[PDB]
Design an enzyme around this catalytic site. Structure first.
Site, PDB file in Angstrom:
ATOM      1  N   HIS A 145       0.975  -1.112  -0.088  1.00 11.42           N
ATOM      2  CA  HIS A 145      -0.126   0.029   0.091  1.00 11.42           C
ATOM      3  C   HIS A 145       0.790   1.371  -0.001  1.00 11.42           C
ATOM      4  CE1 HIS A 145      -3.639  -2.355   0.679  1.00 11.42           C
ATOM      5  NE2 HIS A 145      -2.963  -3.029   1.870  1.00 11.42           N
ATOM      6  N   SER A 151       2.206  -0.427  -5.321  1.00  8.97           N
ATOM      7  CA  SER A 151       1.096  -0.590  -4.182  1.00  8.97           C
ATOM      8  C   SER A 151       0.713  -2.213  -4.209  1.00  8.97           C
ATOM      9  CB  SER A 151      -0.032   0.112  -4.558  1.00  8.97           C
ATOM     10  OG  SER A 151      -0.779   0.136  -3.478  1.00  8.97           O
ATOM     11  N   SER A 201      -5.158   2.028  -2.748  1.00  9.43           N
ATOM     12  CA  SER A 201      -4.747   2.474  -1.463  1.00  9.43           C
ATOM     13  C   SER A 201      -3.586   3.373  -1.722  1.00  9.43           C
ATOM     14  CB  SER A 201      -4.402   1.171  -0.671  1.00  9.43           C
ATOM     15  OG  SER A 201      -3.312   0.511  -1.423  1.00  9.43           O
ATOM     16  N   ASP A 238       2.792  -7.904   0.812  1.00  5.87           N
ATOM     17  CA  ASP A 238       1.680  -7.845   1.475  1.00  5.87           C
ATOM     18  C   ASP A 238       0.528  -8.419   0.508  1.00  5.87           C
ATOM     19  OD1 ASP A 238      -1.142  -6.463   2.173  1.00  5.87           O
ATOM     20  OD2 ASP A 238       0.073  -5.157   3.505  1.00  5.87           O
ATOM     21  N   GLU A 278       3.302 -10.030   5.166  1.00  5.50           N
ATOM     22  CA  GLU A 278       2.580  -9.344   6.319  1.00  5.50           C
ATOM     23  C   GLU A 278       1.228  -9.727   6.511  1.00  5.50           C
ATOM     24  OE1 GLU A 278       2.720  -5.138   5.492  1.00  5.50           O
ATOM     25  OE2 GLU A 278       2.251  -4.671   7.561  1.00  5.50           O
ATOM     26  N   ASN A 304       3.061 -11.646   9.918  1.00  4.10           N
ATOM     27  CA  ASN A 304       1.814 -11.644  10.448  1.00  4.10           C
ATOM     28  C   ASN A 304       1.807 -12.252  11.960  1.00  4.10           C
ATOM     29  OD1 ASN A 304      -1.321 -13.202   9.848  1.00  4.10           O
ATOM     30  ND2 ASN A 304      -0.902 -10.926  10.193  1.00  4.10           N
ATOM     31  N   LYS A 308       3.238  -7.264  15.689  1.00  5.89           N
ATOM     32  CA  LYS A 308       2.459  -7.018  14.447  1.00  5.89           C
ATOM     33  C   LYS A 308       0.976  -7.684  14.601  1.00  5.89           C
ATOM     34  CE  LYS A 308       1.016  -7.619  10.148  1.00  5.89           C
ATOM     35  NZ  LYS A 308      -0.374  -8.092   9.690  1.00  5.89           N
ATOM     36  N   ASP A 365      -2.128  -4.601  14.376  1.00  5.20           N
ATOM     37  CA  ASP A 365      -2.723  -4.645  13.036  1.00  5.20           C
ATOM     38  C   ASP A 365      -3.949  -5.123  13.519  1.00  5.20           C
ATOM     39  OD1 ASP A 365      -2.779  -3.822  10.419  1.00  5.20           O
ATOM     40  OD2 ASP A 365      -2.579  -6.049   9.905  1.00  5.20           O
ATOM     41  N   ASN A 366      -4.264  -5.821  14.403  1.00  4.36           N
ATOM     42  CA  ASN A 366      -5.700  -6.431  14.695  1.00  4.36           C
ATOM     43  C   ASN A 366      -6.328  -5.649  15.596  1.00  4.36           C
ATOM     44  OD1 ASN A 366      -4.526  -9.912  13.959  1.00  4.36           O
ATOM     45  ND2 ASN A 366      -5.055  -8.367  12.605  1.00  4.36           N
ATOM     46  N   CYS A 422      -7.831  -1.323  15.152  1.00  2.00           N
ATOM     47  CA  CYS A 422      -9.104  -1.156  15.015  1.00  2.00           C
ATOM     48  C   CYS A 422      -9.845  -0.297  16.173  1.00  2.00           C
ATOM     49  CB  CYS A 422      -9.793  -2.637  14.820  1.00  2.00           C
ATOM     50  SG  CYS A 422      -9.224  -3.491  13.317  1.00  2.00           S
ATOM     51  N   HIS A 479     -13.590  -9.230   7.222  1.00  2.00           N
ATOM     52  CA  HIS A 479     -12.935  -9.531   5.879  1.00  2.00           C
ATOM     53  C   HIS A 479     -13.458  -8.623   4.821  1.00  2.00           C
ATOM     54  CE1 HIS A 479     -11.586 -12.029   2.898  1.00  2.00           C
ATOM     55  NE2 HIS A 479     -12.536 -12.247   2.282  1.00  2.00           N
ATOM     56  N   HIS A 488      -5.352   2.645   9.931  1.00  2.00           N
ATOM     57  CA  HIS A 488      -4.535   2.469  11.131  1.00  2.00           C
ATOM     58  C   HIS A 488      -3.678   3.628  11.209  1.00  2.00           C
ATOM     59  CE1 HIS A 488      -5.077  -1.906  11.654  1.00  2.00           C
ATOM     60  NE2 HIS A 488      -6.112  -1.275  11.594  1.00  2.00           N
ATOM     61  N   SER A 505       3.893  -2.748  12.728  1.00  5.82           N
ATOM     62  CA  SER A 505       3.961  -3.706  11.545  1.00  5.82           C
ATOM     63  C   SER A 505       5.306  -3.593  10.706  1.00  5.82           C
ATOM     64  CB  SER A 505       2.870  -3.804  10.877  1.00  5.82           C
ATOM     65  OG  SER A 505       1.781  -3.885  11.320  1.00  5.82           O
ATOM     66  N   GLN A 535       8.634  -5.750   9.683  1.00  7.06           N
ATOM     67  CA  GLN A 535       9.073  -5.975   8.247  1.00  7.06           C
ATOM     68  C   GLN A 535      10.502  -5.840   8.152  1.00  7.06           C
ATOM     69  OE1 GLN A 535       7.967  -7.485   5.577  1.00  7.06           O
ATOM     70  NE2 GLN A 535       5.727  -7.322   5.465  1.00  7.06           N
TER      71      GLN A 535
HETATM   72  N1  LIG Z   1     -10.603  -3.747   8.978  1.00  5.32           N
HETATM   73  C1  LIG Z   1      -9.004  -3.709   9.287  1.00  5.32           C
HETATM   74  O1  LIG Z   1      -8.350  -2.844   9.142  1.00  5.32           O
HETATM   75  C2  LIG Z   1      -8.613  -5.214   9.803  1.00  5.32           C
HETATM   76  C3  LIG Z   1      -7.347  -5.270  10.567  1.00  5.32           C
HETATM   77  C4  LIG Z   1      -6.892  -6.677  10.718  1.00  5.32           C
HETATM   78  C5  LIG Z   1      -7.760  -7.571  10.492  1.00  5.32           C
HETATM   79  N2  LIG Z   1      -8.829  -7.701   9.642  1.00  5.32           N
HETATM   80  C6  LIG Z   1      -9.669  -8.693   9.375  1.00  5.32           C
HETATM   81  O2  LIG Z   1     -10.686  -8.959  10.479  1.00  5.32           O
HETATM   82  C7  LIG Z   1     -11.245 -10.030  10.397  1.00  5.32           C
HETATM   83  C8  LIG Z   1     -11.014 -10.969  11.896  1.00  5.32           C
HETATM   84  O3  LIG Z   1      -9.653 -10.730  12.189  1.00  5.32           O
HETATM   85  P1  LIG Z   1      -9.358 -11.361  13.500  1.00  5.32           P
HETATM   86  O4  LIG Z   1      -7.968 -11.300  13.564  1.00  5.32           O
HETATM   87  O5  LIG Z   1     -10.125 -10.764  14.502  1.00  5.32           O
HETATM   88  O6  LIG Z   1      -9.710 -13.021  13.371  1.00  5.32           O
HETATM   89  P2  LIG Z   1      -9.828 -13.952  14.700  1.00  5.32           P
HETATM   90  O7  LIG Z   1     -10.092 -15.361  14.130  1.00  5.32           O
HETATM   91  O8  LIG Z   1      -8.909 -13.762  15.635  1.00  5.32           O
HETATM   92  O9  LIG Z   1     -11.269 -13.668  15.244  1.00  5.32           O
HETATM   93  C9  LIG Z   1     -12.592 -13.824  14.561  1.00  5.32           C
HETATM   94  C10 LIG Z   1     -13.572 -14.429  15.274  1.00  5.32           C
HETATM   95  O10 LIG Z   1     -14.834 -14.589  14.567  1.00  5.32           O
HETATM   96  C11 LIG Z   1     -15.514 -15.546  15.185  1.00  5.32           C
HETATM   97  N3  LIG Z   1     -16.601 -16.012  14.472  1.00  5.32           N
HETATM   98  C12 LIG Z   1     -16.505 -16.697  13.464  1.00  5.32           C
HETATM   99  N4  LIG Z   1     -17.475 -16.841  12.647  1.00  5.32           N
HETATM  100  C13 LIG Z   1     -18.678 -16.056  13.527  1.00  5.32           C
HETATM  101  C14 LIG Z   1     -19.842 -16.025  13.319  1.00  5.32           C
HETATM  102  N5  LIG Z   1     -20.602 -16.596  12.137  1.00  5.32           N
HETATM  103  N6  LIG Z   1     -20.810 -15.360  14.289  1.00  5.32           N
HETATM  104  C15 LIG Z   1     -19.957 -14.843  15.039  1.00  5.32           C
HETATM  105  N7  LIG Z   1     -18.395 -15.205  15.461  1.00  5.32           N
HETATM  106  C16 LIG Z   1     -17.971 -15.531  14.663  1.00  5.32           C
HETATM  107  C17 LIG Z   1     -14.559 -16.504  15.764  1.00  5.32           C
HETATM  108  O11 LIG Z   1     -14.894 -17.566  16.530  1.00  5.32           O
HETATM  109  C18 LIG Z   1     -13.566 -15.841  15.804  1.00  5.32           C
HETATM  110  O12 LIG Z   1     -13.154 -15.557  17.428  1.00  5.32           O
HETATM  111  C19 LIG Z   1     -10.291 -11.008   9.497  1.00  5.32           C
HETATM  112  O13 LIG Z   1     -11.020 -10.994   8.188  1.00  5.32           O
HETATM  113  C20 LIG Z   1      -9.097 -10.193   9.093  1.00  5.32           C
HETATM  114  O14 LIG Z   1      -8.496 -10.332   8.070  1.00  5.32           O
HETATM  115  C21 LIG Z   1      -9.529  -6.343   9.335  1.00  5.32           C
END
Ligand SMILES: NC(=O)c1ccc[n+]([C@@H]2O[C@H](COP(=O)([O-])OP(=O)(O)OC[C@H]3O[C@@H](n4cnc5c(N)ncnc54)[C@H](O)[C@@H]3O)[C@@H](O)[C@H]2O)c1
Ligand SMILES: NC(=O)c1ccc[n+]([C@@H]2O[C@H](COP(=O)([O-])OP(=O)(O)OC[C@H]3O[C@@H](n4cnc5c(N)ncnc54)[C@H](O)[C@@H]3O)[C@@H](O)[C@H]2O)c1
Ligand SMILES: NC(=O)c1ccc[n+]([C@@H]2O[C@H](COP(=O)([O-])OP(=O)(O)OC[C@H]3O[C@@H](n4cnc5c(N)ncnc54)[C@H](O)[C@@H]3O)[C@@H](O)[C@H]2O)c1
Ligand SMILES: NC(=O)c1ccc[n+]([C@@H]2O[C@H](COP(=O)([O-])OP(=O)(O)OC[C@H]3O[C@@H](n4cnc5c(N)ncnc54)[C@H](O)[C@@H]3O)[C@@H](O)[C@H]2O)c1
Lengths: 468, 468, 468, 468
Positions: free
Chosen positions: B53, B76, B81, B130, B192, B217, B222, B226-227, B231, B337, B387, B395, B399
């Site tokens: 990105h 990118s 992005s 990435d 990543e 990751n 990281k 990131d997670n 958020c 997602h 972020h 992060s 890298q």
């Molecule tokens: N928006 C962003 O900037 C950003 C940043 C990082 C990650 N993400 C994305 O966020 C999503 C989740 O990431 P994470 O790290 O929290 O994953 P995670 O695996 O740690 O957590 C996901 C949770 O969802 C639950 N789950 C699954 N199906 C479900 C359902 N039908 N109903 C209720 N709960 C359910 C699981 O039990 C799990 O605990 C991923 O797609 C990830 O790539 C987004």
């Protein structure tokens, strides 16, 4: 007829029973475990020696193990953590228990030794341990018995000197080969706490571990619940019962920001303190900084915090030099497993004034005073009642399942003389058992959703590496 | 002078340089990396192809790599992005970059291919990826070049047709053996993201991975930034920018309680919402309950909540049935997602009214409306700014250390053609590099204390199983 | 020796003295008041009858009054709020005190009457009251003594039957005109609590108030500190000591969101409960809603909350119909001044099992049970130790200043037979006396800034109707 | 009107209208007021001159006033607070509006004067003010018209200079007696903000107030909601939009802990900052300390905080000496009503670099920089969107009601040339209007309960001195 116990006062049994009945309602994981495994009697023939804080919560565990078939002998793993009403109920139920709140170090170790003298002759065949003291007695004894007696003549603390004197006395008094006989008969040990688990892995790594072991502390449903939320609830409870201080407006310093430190800092912050933290680990320190805690050294904190809590599992965290620098009537306490986090022994030449049980005021030559809680032993159990029942239900469900693994599910020797953890399926099961009581409505994955994220609908839902 | 770049407008460079400078101050981990590692020039001789990105924060990483000695080409990893002023400042610094906000998918792929045309005629010797697109280009070309070309004629989608057409074009326009030349020269890749790591583990399992890989990751620093923390900082920001709604009073529903859901629930509760959560994992559900969130199904929440956030990584979380039941002007967004937590396609026959970019009002036949943010794509990127810089510093510092490991610390072949994670001492190092700016003062263990807990004074301080 | 007291056990005196010494450090307002006023002896000649919870904090108040020259007699204003070690310390100091934790209602009222039997004969000349019971005894007896005795034959409860019997007994056993002699000799009353203050304004509006009154509850440094932060600290302390329940994960219901309700909701929320509130006042309701509390009726909450707390100062908040609908082992308690917030009398035909002091389990015909704390009397004082010393220093410095105003500063009759509040200069002074202990560094207005906002540099800083 | 307006871009009207529609759903107080009073037309004949931030929320108030019969002319009361889509929608509805985000001080004052030139001839007969500028124009012009002109030659700021030049221009250009004619025709003013209300009580005390005034700020449903929860929502919104910095762990300093400072400190703490406060008022300081904030001087904070916010209503809070001591790229802003809380004028000889609208970097000779938001004018309105709709509904319902009182309910002269507050019956009514939207269910007192606590079942529930 039944006299094989040592408790403060057997007349407390009825009170004990009332509070055990109340705890059962709050311990759905133990109660469901009794219902599921009662008919299978997986612990029939088990002779469990337990060394774990003799609280109402522990009483529910004891009776669970008994309901599954176990014969039992019990002691506390701390001199101030026993709840005397709980101990009395267990004794009145005909289970041998040697546990008194405020027992001495001498008594503590003599009682631990009583675990291994099974009624009717013989020894235990399982250990359920919290902090590793029972396990340590067997291993030190066995070491000395095989000829390596030199460590015993070389003590380096008061408790350590009492311990060595005990092992020498057992070697003198018991039949020859008595430690080896115990060693041979113990089918496994399950260990509750971070300090105990360290002791296990040290033995496994040196090749000295004598029987299989399960590390219960590292179940997610133990370390991320008991150590964290239990301390969140019970740290400030111990401080309030001991001191009745106003926490709003006070500065608190917590040493350590691991599982217990995170809980402890939260406990104090939620009660209204402005909390500072120390850490040696930069990841844990960064976690503390990201929650808005000031991260400082104990030297920086000593002259200015109102309340000090050690939560490291390490030694010499709060030293005589720090305590000399503290403000008058600063409160000091420890929530880590052993008292050596604080240099209590360095204060023993000073004037101590006992305020009440587990509260002492210590005066320095310059006339400043500090308030010491439980003589530096676990403040949550010493000054209050430890963690509430609901969270201990999660921990003790894990213990029960560990005892079943080692006692009943090792016919194929899947558990060798190494340290193991419970599988994720059992960890999740423990959580699942606690959901209805607190009104959680869990979502069920449809088959296509389960497939989409790569799990089975019934779990496990996460990889073994997942950190929660 | 310098012409080896494609950007929207090179006149944006001064504006880009001004914003990069502000970001530097908030990226202390990267800036400290330059200070500490610059003297040894550990990336001298590195020829790094990066696909990430093309933002102001990424420019600070690029310039950190260059400050350590690296020669660089950059694209990118996503068509939208790119920040055109960041791309222009990088091109104006003499670094080849091929990145335009809103480029076509065809341009996206041709630009990716340009990573591999090194000035002077060679190839890169390192990849910083990435999502894995650059790494896939090398692997797909190599597979085809070695004689297995059938797959190139079987695209599954429009995007895949474009990628396959690129591979075919490079097989005609670059010398015979070009892909094998690239593969032999690449000393490693650092990846990543989860999609990219999944691709690496598939190739490693099939024996097709052409060079060592580090999964960035998975590190604690990281993943948490990131997670979780990113958020936590950005979800409410996106809701406010999109809707300007008062959050105090409101009920919010968050689907999922892994790291993104934890951060999201926390963002909302912080802002004053009453937060409910759904979960399918009983452990995560119990965590949410212990934090005081009501855990319910989406069916129970649908008629009730004022705001909905999907954070599961799964599909079909908020369906047409749920949206039909929602209150008038409920807000609905996704932070999980990229697509299809929300059934956006199911709303295709309803009246959509655009309010402003990334904010739409959908009307149902019974006349209730819902407000949809970012057409059900990521709300923190569509309605806010993603972020913050400090979070990206965590992060990107990971890298940087991964590139150093593969490029400079593989003389003894410790890294074979497999997927590795950064060892804990480097994960710890990432944290260390951020401590001064956030104002942390770390404690140093004395020798006896390190001995006591079984660690070296310099770390690592935790086992590889520790969960923090 | 000295025998003019009734306490549980005089041998608790040494323990009481130790905790009183500890409290002094935490009560800088009272201690500063001793230093300032002790030389002037403004209460020399005062005969203060105190009716206020006989806790360690009150002991520091009593000894402050004495240091200023007062002669004193004391009783508790609740049957369960005495701290027996505090009472014993006060008796051992030679001060008449009639206060036992767990005294009967008959004892309670006979003890109240003992206030008015001054040593040597004669009456008090000041009253210090919390809840208005002492004040009510004087007014009721005066009413009846003047000829209006019909009310005494119409008791509306057990407590009222006892109170009326007492007034009848006094009219028979004390000289003719005794209540009128008391009334003539009382120079003033200072009143601590919201309920007692309401009783004072009732009498003032009716023209029946017999002497000047200071409403101490409405000092900002009382109502916005002791009612709010005091309950925030002490409510959960009471619930934990009585029940040892896990609060994280529980739902709680607080009736009322005035000062005490605000503090109580916060206590529970900070301890981890999901908190709901009821209110009749739409402004207070909207405040609760904006703070993220669900606002519902008691009928809505009754079957579903785990913990119920009444905080209204009103009556019939938790009825038999609610309690019949509660879940098994719901906890019920009251933090309002009087026990009629809960319909305890409606429970007396049910099966009561005592658990321990101030903890009872009540079983209904359908076998569901509730846990009642302190038989519906103030839970924070009954099951724990009331508010911590620091906040009580603010309340009790106000009390001491009010006693000085009425006893020493009424030579010009500035205080007539009406209810007054302390002026803002004294309210600010009370706050100032507490700043150093908690490490506050106050900014001083530059003269130009003071002029700009229209205040003196020394204050007062706010208008009389500022709400803070 | 058709022609009679100045906005940035009339083409934004459609967008403005869409956000106004969305705001209406969030503003039940204003919509209920339209529904009740629209058919009664209480403002028919009113000619309201409004000076209040020209935001979407204000657009809903304007359209409410119009729905009540009012003829209206409007300007913003700050140069950076206008939302240009809001202004365009009002202009497109045929209402004269003179408001542009980023207008100059010259334009600001010329636009204020345009209020008073009624379309079709004559003057307004009502003022709705926020900050007192429109009211000050009338009073300063009156003063000079009556012969006291010397003050116009002695300005203390650039803004005063502009203001006095305007007064001169009007005296030159308008007919003789113009200010006296305006003063005669104005039936009242309703004033929104703490600083404006202070200006009013000062005129009322010196007997120069020309018409009746209602202090809207001191409604409980204004001061304890808008000032507090509004800032809690919008302060961090401004800082994030201006700077996009990570807030977790940053140290922030808030000057003032009145209603706005309390909200501001909460805003930052909720966003993860470690917050310090300054105060001059010992009661407000003690409140901050009890909420766990470190209370320090600005001198102590200057070298160490990352973010500074002034929330005092006073002047010279952040001086050039403070700013010289700040760390590089510290963020400085003001959420009080005027730009003299920070010494912005003392910065004008330094090098300013614009970053984006309402964000500037200022470099000192030693090369450290600071980030200034909105040139020291209200940050929440200048860098973001002001308070969210729902809490503005509470403030603007109070405004509407005050306009009805002064315009329609002063036939008996109950409102003289003094400052009044709305009665509690109306304050309670405003709160009731907001309960249903936010999901509150209010409990209804039985007659016996209402009598027991001394209130009517329909309220008011609290005495006039009650502080909430
Ligand atoms: N928006 C962003 O900037 C950003 C940043 C990082 C990650 N993400 C994305 O966020 C999503 C989740 O990431 P994470 O790290 O929290 O994953 P995670 O695996 O740690 O957590 C996901 C949770 O969802 C639950 N789950 C699954 N199906 C479900 C359902 N039908 N109903 C209720 N709960 C359910 C699981 O039990 C799990 O605990 C991923 O797609 C990830 O790539 C987004
Ligand atoms: N109810 C209780 O009181 C209770 C419950 C669980 C565990 N424990 C005990 O608490 C202790 C800690 O357990 P844990 O699970 O939190 O361990 P942990 O490893 O998760 O955390 C301990 C932390 O202390 C830090 N540390 C070590 N030395 C330090 C020093 N000199 N200064 C500051 N920080 C230092 C470590 O870096 C680590 O992060 C153990 O003794 C454990 O057995 C007590
Ligand atoms: N336990 C303690 O230490 C302690 C400390 C201070 C005060 N008090 C007592 O607490 C009680 C409350 O005091 P306060 O200062 O908060 O009073 P308050 O007037 O400030 O608050 C009481 C609230 O109860 C609400 N209310 C009245 N009837 C109601 C009903 N039927 N349902 C729901 N809400 C209802 C009112 O609207 C009001 O907001 C009084 O009895 C007071 O004397 C106790
Ligand atoms: N930006 C907004 O949206 C918004 C909203 C409402 C009010 N306001 C404005 O905010 C300002 C403050 O309003 P308020 O209602 O909080 O007033 P307030 O009187 O309730 O509080 C101001 C506080 O500043 C303190 N103070 C004064 N001088 C000080 C100094 N030198 N250092 C530290 N503290 C000092 C006072 O002691 C007081 O407690 C006013 O100008 C008001 O008009 C702004």
């Amino acid at each position: 007829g039944f006299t094989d116990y040592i408790v403060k006062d057997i007349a407390l049994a009825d009170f004990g029973r009332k509070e055990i009945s109340l705890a059962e309602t709050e311990m759905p994981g133990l109660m469901a475990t009794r219902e599921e495994y009662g008919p299978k009697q997986p612990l029939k023939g088990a002779r469990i020696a337990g060394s774990l804080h003799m609280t109402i919560q522990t009483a529910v565990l004891i009776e669970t193990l008994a309901a599954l078939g176990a014969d039992i002998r019990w002691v506390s793993c701390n001199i101030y953590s026993t709840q005397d009403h709980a101990a009395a109920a267990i004794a009145a139920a005909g289970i041998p228990v040697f546990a008194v709140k405020g027992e001495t170090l001498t008594e503590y170790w003599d009682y631990t030794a009583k675990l291994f003298d099974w009624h009717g002759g013989g020894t235990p065949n399982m250990i359920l341990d919290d902090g590793g003291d029972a396990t340590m007695l067997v291993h030190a004894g066995y070491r000395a018995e095989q000829g390596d007696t030199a460590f015993l003549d070389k003590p380096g603390s008061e408790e350590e000197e009492i311990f060595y004197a005990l092992v020498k006395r057992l070697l003198k008094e018991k039949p020859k080969g008595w430690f080896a006989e115990i060693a041979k008969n113990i089918k496994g040990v399950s260990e509750e706490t971070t300090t105990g688990v360290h002791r296990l892995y040290e033995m496994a790594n040196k090749g000295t571990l004598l029987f299989p072991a399960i590390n219960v502390n590292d179940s997610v449903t133990k370390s991320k619940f008991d150590n964290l939320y239990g301390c969140r609830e019970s740290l400030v409870d111990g401080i309030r019962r001991g001191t009745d201080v106003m926490l709003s407006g006070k500065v608190a310093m917590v040493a350590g920001f691991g599982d217990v430190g995170k809980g402890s800092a939260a406990s104090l912050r939620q009660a209204g303190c402005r909390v500072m933290v120390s850490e040696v680990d930069p990841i844990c320190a960064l976690q503390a900084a990201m929650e808005g805690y000031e991260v400082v050294t104990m030297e920086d904190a000593a002259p200015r915090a109102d309340i000090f809590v050690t939560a490291t599992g390490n030694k010499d965290i709060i030293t005589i030099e720090h305590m000399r620098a503290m403000k008058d009537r600063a409160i000091v306490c420890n929530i880590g497993h052993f008292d050596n986090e604080i240099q209590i022994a360095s204060l023993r030449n000073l004037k101590w004034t006992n305020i009440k049980p587990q509260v002492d005021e210590i005066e320095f030559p310059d006339k400043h005073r500090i308030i010491m809680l439980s003589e530096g032993r676990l403040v949550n159990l010493g000054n209050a009642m430890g963690h509430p029942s609901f969270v201990m239900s999660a921990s003790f469900t894990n213990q029960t399942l560990a005892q079943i693994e080692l006692f009943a599910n090792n016919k194929d020797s899947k558990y060798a003389k190494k340290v193991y953890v419970l599988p994720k399926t059992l960890d999740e099961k423990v959580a699942r058992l606690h959901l209805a009581k607190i009104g959680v409505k869990l979502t069920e994955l449809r088959k296509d959703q389960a497939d989409y994220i790569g799990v089975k609908q019934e779990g496990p839902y996460k990889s073994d590496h997942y950190r929660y």
